[PDB]
Symmetry: D2
Subunit: 297 residues, 4 copies
């Protein structure tokens, strides 16, 4: 049984994916929203399961973590039958005062168990720095692809740009292009990329930046919500999809604003679900317009 990207898309062929696999960064959001410190692991588990129950009916796939919610979402059947389960395969290493300074393949992740539990894909964050070795990132991606493919799971990579370890020469926009030049043809099934310009400013500049990015990615790609205001993300998905993206992966832009509000299950249903549904409707509209365009050729 070998899964393809068609097992994690909407019926339109677009991707409408939800990330709830955030770890110490999610603990730090709960503390900054006034939750009593230190914040227990159970606060994250309860949010993650509630988010999966409320939001998986509107997502073509949901991304979860072993550390805080894998066992619970699987045992409580939190994930709607219409939504594919993606499991994070990344181990985040803190350093320099931040939770995710470096990343390796998480060796505690068991692809056999994920496959028997009905999981369809794995995701790997790749931190990209101009002064760190390309060949080590390519080697880690190649090992991860083989881990996925040998179990018939889909391989998803998420290159995220960081400033160099040494020096102050850092253009975020050029880094996103340089990471796509390096990793855009690295043999994964799906590429998750940061939105150019944080989705800000005139639509024309946003489209031109997204088109340059499309030129260096030789697999299906989606935009992350990371660093885009939740109010600009729907337009970023329309622009990215105009330039050749096949949908989105949304995390904070869908669920961050209700962190620390009372009646968590009610807030996920009334505040977060409408945003995730609108992003799904946008993907269906852009894929319909692409079928008319690909038919003109």
């Amino acid at each position: 049984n070998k899964y393809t990207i068609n097992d994690i898309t909407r019926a339109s062929g677009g991707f409408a994916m939800l990330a709830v696999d955030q770890r110490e960064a999610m603990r730090m959001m709960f503390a900054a929203a006034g939750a009593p410190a230190p914040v227990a692991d159970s606060v994250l588990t309860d949010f993650k399961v509630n988010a999966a129950k409320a939001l998986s009916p509107y997502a073509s796939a949901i991304l979860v973590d072993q550390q805080f919610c894998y066992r619970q979402v699987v045992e409580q059947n939190a994930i709607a039958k219409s939504c594919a389960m993606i499991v994070a395969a990344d181990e985040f290493i803190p350093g320099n005062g931040i939770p995710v300074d470096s990343v390796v393949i998480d060796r505690k992740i068991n692809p056999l168990q994920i496959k028997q539990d009905g999981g369809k894909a794995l995701k790997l964050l790749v931190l990209w720095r101009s002064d760190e070795d390309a060949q080590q990132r390519l080697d880690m991606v190649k090992e991860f692809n083989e881990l996925c493919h040998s179990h018939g799971l889909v391989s998803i990579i998420e290159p995220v740009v960081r400033p160099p370890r040494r020096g102050d020469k850092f253009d975020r926009e050029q880094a996103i292009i340089d990471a796509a030049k390096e990793l855009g043809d690295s043999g994964a099934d799906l590429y998750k990329v940061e939105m150019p310009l944080y989705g800000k400013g005139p639509q024309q500049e946003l489209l031109c930046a997204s088109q340059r990015l499309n030129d260096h990615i030789n697999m299906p790609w989606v935009i992350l919500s990371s660093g885009v205001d939740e109010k600009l993300f729907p337009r970023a998905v329309r622009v990215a999809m105009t330039a050749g993206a096949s949908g989105f992966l949304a995390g904070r832009a869908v669920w961050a604003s209700v962190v620390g509000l009372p009646d968590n299950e009610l807030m996920l249903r009334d505040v977060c679900a409408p945003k995730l549904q609108q992003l799904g409707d946008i993907v269906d509209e852009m894929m319909a317009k692409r079928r008319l365009e690909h038919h003109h050729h």
Copy 2:
């Protein structure tokens, strides 16, 4: 032709209403979001028409103002045929450094023209202060009811509590109750009330406050979004409707967050519409549960 509240409701009998009739308060929002000052009237007109075009398909009624958008929404057919047009009949008088210090019936509002244009209702803000004369507020409401009813328009009143002109003795929560005791049986067809506790805190305290309010209102009522965080408004509508409300009037909680963003028409469609649709679905759910009681 005599309209009733049934002509401004969803098919469920609930109210899912949008307010875009804000005046100098809306100019001040545009300036505080960084629009170049002074902000031209046309910036408000363009927002109001765009909001009517984008959002009226999801509203059982939309509330508009003569000052900035009535002529444009009517002439450009901005309002969906499934959405009733409500026209503001209030003249806001600035004072003490705020745009709405006092309010009178706007004598430039022409109910005959509104009725010929397909309008179904008028709305009147009533500022309520403990140390201002109850009898003057009742007299203004009674004149407004007769202005509506004589043209076959629905009469909507919106009591808003303010601190007293003199003294520092002001409990907002008690003021909302005292305004309902005074105006809750004043012969209007619909009562628009401020949400107790700004929709904050434990759901049980919010329901108990909303039930005390329901006890003093003897007409159909809806909650305003005013002073409720857009993230707490959907729960406030669930709680208010549990306590006897028949729906909502939403303004800033639906459209304020996109003020000053680029691609206005795109932002109203992608950010504001999903919030207004979810509030509509909540009203249909609460009305369905009320029918099964």
Copy 3:
């Protein structure tokens, strides 16, 4: 015994005056700085006495209130012998959600007792609004002057501009000029005025505004710190004194930043005193330069 302005000045003839007579506005500052609510009267009394003990050695006069600290500063000898005691004679009336909506002469103030206790002056806030009656403000000033003078106390007035009760036509800068045209020759001994432009922007525009103000004040005058950032107040005193002012009255700009910090007496000594001393040195410098003209 008849006191003159010469009994509330530094040896230079300039005024270096401290206001600690703030009332409910000071309670609201304590609550907004995180003090446990409701804030007890004794929190204000303790701050006011501590500020008088720490800061009166650097002031030519200190302004205190009956409501929170008069009895304590007098009985504990909190005020340095080199500092004149000025007592507030104003009763603040709350309204429209603010602590000082209107002001009258405080009839509980006993000028005989103040004079026996070594007090040298009284101060009266006058709220100025374009659409309120000039003649009532002049009448209140004239009664206050006679109350002071009949006891041999110095008479200090503090006109503060507010927006009109009705309308949105309000230019703060023009209001300060119009209040000086009305009250600048009203027979008080000292005029306390708000700084033009909140002491912001290029020094030349600030001087030109301060010279226009000097043209409409026909008694010695000082600038209030009210609405000027504590970092811009020393320049405002230099500019106002260039334009004809004789010094300053400082409140929040001297003591506000330590509200809610621990070790109150230490913070008043180490943070607030150096600011008050620098303002005193500026007044001595400007008065010296005026004598050499």
Copy 4:
């Protein structure tokens, strides 16, 4: 001609020192206060010279940098005859998105020229991390001491604690003690230390923390203002001096609040000078009380 710490103290024997040697961190403050970007080097030079002219009359020593103001303060005689000139000998290396990720001895610094220009000391920042090699920090301090002492200049070290390169195990308060245990007897003439608890909270806890620090420093020491609110710094100097410190080094706590205000020379005189004078008066008061205490023994 061999200078001692007595050449950089007030007449009381206490230290009342002003730092204006900030580099890219000072450019970033000007940009965040609304100065038109990119901020020219001349904006920093003009601030630094104006600060030296206005504030050196109230300081026992002023710390300046070659990069932005050394030549100008020396040629314009900006530094009052009563104030010793200290020159920074540190080269800041940016990395990980911050201006000062690592530090080495600045080889462009010419101690002979500094000594001929009337300079009395050099200062070296030492970044301290639990998972970086102690022996490399000690080696750099020993080389710097010999560079100073061979020219008859005073040697000043400034250990500043940072989180580890790897891991999330970081107690700032314990790091300040561990840095003093390592470097507190490293043969410099003066130790500049960060204030425990950022000078916050009850005076008794602040004194106990400062006493523990005094136990691990075997040379004269002063507190930095870095991370202490300008409103808490005077109390921090009283507490640190109660626990055995001999004064202060103030930077942002003296001059930061006037960055971007108009009439720079007027603001330095009326806002910044009174704060620096009060800190000087506190040092004189604490040294007088120490002469009575050292006389009881």
